[PDB]
C-alpha cells in the first residue's frame, strides 16, 4: 500500500 | 501531437478561448506529468494551471478534458504534501467527488485515484475528503451483486482509495466513517483478486492499529477467520498485511486474542517463525510475545501447537530484532505461566540460546533475558531443583556472562545480575 | 505479563 501513487 | 510540449505552450493553449486547444494543452500536460523521470510538477503549479484543471473537471460537455485534467491533477497530488496541498487548495476535492458519479468509468476511476492520493497525504486531508462526502459515492460504486462484474483496475483503485481512508493516525479515521466502510471491506476481503485482498488486509491492519475499541469494531465483524486463512496465502503481499492485522488484534484484550487463537492462527506460525522474510519472522515473533503475555490457557495453546521449539529456534538464529522479540516472548511466558510450563521451556532447550544472547550490546535485551532467568529460577525453587538449573547455566557458559554483567555500565543490569549470582550462584 | 507494541 503506497500512500500516494501516480498513473504511468 | 501532444508529446514533449513546454509549460509555455501548455499555458498558451489552456489560456486560449478554444475548448479544443485547451483539451490539447491539458493532454500535453497529462503526458508531461505521466513521465517517470522528473515530472515537472512544480513548474506546472507555478504556471498557475491547477485552477484551470479544476475548472475543466466540471465540463461535463467535454468528458475528454475532464478525464485529462483528472489525470493531471492525480499525478500532481501524487507527490509531496505541498503539491497535494496545491491541488486541494484549488478546490479539487468537491469536483472529484462530483466526478465520482460520471457515466464514464474511466473518469470516475480517475476521481477515485485522485481522492485516494489526497487522502493518502495524512489524517487532515483524509478527514477533509470525508467531510466533503466521499464515502457514500465511493461505496455506491461497489454496490453490485457480484464484485467480479466490475473491472480489475477499477476495483483495485477503489479498494486502494478505501484503504487510504482507513489509514493514518493522530487522529484515527472517524468512527462513523469506519462503521460505514467496514461492511464493504469485508466483501473485498472475500474477493478473489490478490491485489484487492492485499489492500483490504492493509485497510484492516490500519483500522486495528489503535485502542481496543477499534480492534473490537473489526473483530465484531467476523474477519479474524478470513485473516487467518489469508495468513496461509502463498503471496507475501497478502501475508504481510494479514500478519500485521492479526498481530494488532493480539495487542488488545485476552478475549480478542482468543478470537485469533480460536480461528486457527497458531497452526500457521510454524511457517511464519521460519519464514525466509526477516520482517515476517519479526512480526510473527512479536505477535507470539504478545500471546505469551496472555492467560495460561493461551500459553498452553502455544505449547500444544509445538511452538515452543520454534521460539527456541528463533532465539538460536535470527535477526537481532527477531531474537529480541523472542526474548520478550520468553520473559512474558515465564512471568505468567505455570511452573510446569516453565519446566517444559527448559526441557525444549531455552537456556543455552538465551545465555548466548547475554553477550549483546543492547541493554534492554539483557534486562529481559535476566528477568526470564530469574523467573525460571523461582519456578525451580518451587520444585527444589535450582542446583540443576545452576549447573545448566554454568555448563553452557552462563555464569561467566552473569558475573561479567555485574560489571556492566547499567545499574539495573548490575543489581539483577548480582542477585542471581548470589541467591543461586 | 505485559502486551507491548512494535
**Nearest-CA neighbor of B249 among B240, B236, B258, B239?**
B258
- Chain C interface residues (partner B, CB cutoff 8 A): 1-6
Residues B84-123 as b or e (16 or more Cβ within 10 Å = b): bbbbbebebbebbbebbebeeeebbbbbbbbbbbbbbbbe
What is the DSSP secondary-structure string of B14-79?
HTSS-HHHHHHHHHHHHHHHT-SS---HHHHHHHT-HHHHHHHTT-TT-HHHHHHHHHHHHHHHTS
> Using a CB-CB distance cutoff of 8 angstroms, which residues of chain B are in contact with residue C4?
251, 289-290, 293, 328
Contacts of C2 (CB under 8 A, 6+ apart): B293, B332, B335
Contact B320, B281 (CB under 8 A): no
- Among candidate residues B274, B362, B285, the one with its CA nearest the CA of residue B323: B285
Indicate yes or no: CB of B250 within 8 angstroms of CB of C3.
yes
Q: At B377, list the grid cell.
A: 529460577
C6 neighbourhood in chain B, CB within 8 Å: 286
Helices (H), B208-235: 212-219, 224-231
Considering only the beta carbons, identify the residue of B250, B252, B293 that sits closest to C1.
Answer: B293
Domain parsing of chain B, residue ranges: 1-425
Count Cβ atoms within 10 A of the Cβ of residue B18 and give its class: 0-12 exposed, 13-18 middle, 19 or more buried.
exposed
Within 10 angstroms of residue B374's Cβ, the number of other Cβ atoms is 18
The CA distance from B102 to B112, in Å, is: 11
Closest-CA distance of chain B to residue C5, Å:
7
Given the C-alpha cell 458519479, which residue does it identify? B101
Number of DSSP helices (H) and strands (E) in chain C, helices first? 0, 0
Chain C residues with CB under 8 Å of B331 CB are 1
How many other β-carbons are positioned within 10 Å of the β-carbon of residue B384? 8
Which backbone phi and psi does B417 adopt, to 5 degrees? -55, -45
Neighboring chains of A (3 or more beta-carbon pairs < 8 A): B
Identify the sign of the CA torsion B32, B34, B36, B38. positive
Look at residue B206 and give its three-state secondary structure. helix
Q: Residue B275 corresponds to which cell in the numbers above?
A: 519464514
Residue of C nearest to B324 (CA): C6
The DSSP symbol for A1 reads -
Task: Characterise B306 by phi-psi region: left (phi > 0), alpha (psi -120 to 50), beta (else).
Answer: left
- How far apart CA B148 and CA B105 sit, in angstroms, is 16
Nearest by CB: C2 against B252, B286, B332: B332
Whether residue B74 and residue A6 make contact (CB cut-off 8 A), yes or no, is yes
Contacts of B367 (CB under 8 A, 6+ apart): B410, B412, B413, B416
Query: How many DSSP H helices and E strands does chain B contain?
Result: 28, 0
Return the DSSP state at B407.
Answer: T
Q: Do B293 and C3 touch (CB under 8 A)?
A: yes
CA dihedral (B373, B379, B380, B384) positive or negative? positive
Query: Which three cell numbers, joined as nine digits, stand for B55?
Result: 475548472
To the nearest 10 degrees (0 to 180), the angle between helices B152-165 and B105-119 is 30
After which residues does chain C show a gap where C to N exceeds 2.5 Å?
none
Q: From CA B5, how far away is CA B12, in angstroms rounded?
A: 11
Q: Is B362 exposed, middle or buried (0-12, 13-18, 19+ CB in 10 A)?
A: middle
Q: How far is CA B109 from CA B116, B195, B312, in A?
A: 10, 16, 50
Q: Are B289 and B325 in contact (CB under 8 A)?
A: yes
For B158-195, give the DSSP string.
HHHHHHHHS---SSPPPHHHHHHHHHHHHHHHT-S-HH
- One-character DSSP codes across B345-381: HHHHT-HHHHHTTTT-S-HHHHHHHHHHHHHHHHHHH
Cβ-contact B287, B330 below 8 angstroms = no
The residues, any chain, with a CB within 8 Å of residue B381's CB and separated by 6 or more, are: none
- Contact call for B328 and C5, based on CB within 8 A: no
**DSSP 8-state code for residue B326:** H
Half-sphere exposure of B262 (CA within 13 A, CB side): 11
DSSP designation for B250: T
Cell numbers linked to B291:
500471546
Measured between alpha carbons, how far is residue B98 from residues B49, B70, B156, B330 in Å? 20, 12, 20, 55
d(CA B67, CA B83): 20
The helix/strand/coil state of B408 is coil
Which residue, B92, B85, B98, B96, is CA-closest to B42?
B85
Distance CA B41, CA B29 (A): 10
| Cβ(B350)–Cβ(B310) below 8 Å | no
Say which residue the cell 492485522 belongs to.
Answer: B245
Residue B417 at interface with chain A, using a CB cutoff of 8 Å: no
For B313: left if phi > 0, alpha if psi spans -120 to 50, otherwise beta; the answer is alpha
Amino acid at each position: 500500500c503506497h500512500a500516494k501513487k501516480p498513473r504511468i | 501531437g501532444t508529446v514533449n510540449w513546454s509549460v509555455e505552450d501548455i499555458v498558451k493553449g489552456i489560456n486560449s478561448n478554444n475548448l479544443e486547444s485547451q483539451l490539447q494543452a491539458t493532454q500535453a500536460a497529462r503526458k508531461l506529468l505521466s513521465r517517470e523521470k522528473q515530472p515537472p510538477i512544480d513548474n506546472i503549479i507555478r504556471a498557475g494551471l491547477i485552477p484551470k484543471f479544476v475548472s475543466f473537471l466540471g465540463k461535463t460537455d467535454c468528458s475528454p478534458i475532464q478525464f485529462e485534467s483528472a489525470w493531471a491533477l492525480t499525478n500532481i497530488a501524487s507527490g509531496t504534501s505541498e503539491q497535494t496541498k496545491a491541488v486541494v487548495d484549488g478546490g479539487a476535492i468537491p469536483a472529484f467527488i462530483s466526478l465520482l458519479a460520471s457515466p464514464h468509468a474511466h473518469i470516475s476511476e480517475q476521481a477515485v485515484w485522485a481522492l485516494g492520493n489526497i487522502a493518502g497525504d495524512g489524517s487532515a486531508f483524509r478527514d477533509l475528503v470525508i467531510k466533503h462526502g466521499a464515502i457514500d459515492p465511493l461505496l455506491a460504486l461497489l454496490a453490485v451483486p457480484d464484485l467480479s462484474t466490475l473491472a480489475c483496475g477499477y476495483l483495485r483503485n477503489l479498494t486502494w482509495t478505501l484503504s487510504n481512508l482507513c489509514r493514518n493516525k493522530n487522529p484515527a479515521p472517524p468512527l462513523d466513517a469506519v462503521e460505514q466502510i467496514l461492511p464493504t471491506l469485508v466483501r473485498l476481503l472475500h474477493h478473489n483478486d490478490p491485489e484487492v485482498l492485499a489492500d483490504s488486509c492493509w485497510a484492516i491492519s490500519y483500522l486495528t492499529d489503535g485502542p481496543n475499541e477499534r480492534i473490537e469494531m473489526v473483530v465484531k465483524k467476523g474477519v479474524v477467520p478470513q485473516l487467518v486463512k489469508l495468513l496461509g496465502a502463498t503471496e507475501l503481499p497478502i501475508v504481510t498485511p494479514a500478519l500485521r492485522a492479526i498481530g494488532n488484534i493480539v495487542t488488545g484484550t485476552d478475549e480478542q486474542t482468543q478470537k485469533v487463537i480460536d480461528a486457527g492462527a497458531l497452526a500457521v506460525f510454524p511457517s511464519l517463525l521460519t519464514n525466509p522474510k526477516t520482517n515476517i519472522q519479526k512480526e510473527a515473533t512479536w505477535t507470539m510475545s504478545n500471546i505469551t503475555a496472555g492467560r495460561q490457557d493461551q500459553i498452553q495453546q502455544v505449547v500444544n501447537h509445538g511452538l515452543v521449539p520454534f521460539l527456541v529456534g528463533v532465539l538460536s538464529k535470527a535477526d537481532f530484532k527477531t531474537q529480541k522479540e523472542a526474548a520478550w516472548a520468553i520473559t512474558n511466558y515465564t512471568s505468567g505461566g505455570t511452573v510446569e510450563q516453565i519446566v517444559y521451556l527448559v526441557h525444549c532447550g531455552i537456556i543455552e540460546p538465551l545465555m548466548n544472547l547475554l553477550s549483546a550490546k543492547d541493554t534492554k535485551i539483557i534486562q529481559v533475558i535476566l528477568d526470564a532467568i530469574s523467573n525460571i529460577f523461582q519456578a525451580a525453587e518451587k520444585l527444589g531443583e535450582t542446583e540443576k538449573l545452576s549447573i545448566m547455566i554454568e555448563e553452557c557458559g552462563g555464569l561467566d556472562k552473569i558475573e561479567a554483567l555485574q560489571r556492566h555500565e547499567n545499574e539495573s543490569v548490575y543489581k539483577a545480575s548480582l542477585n542471581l549470582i548470589e541467591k543461586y550462584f
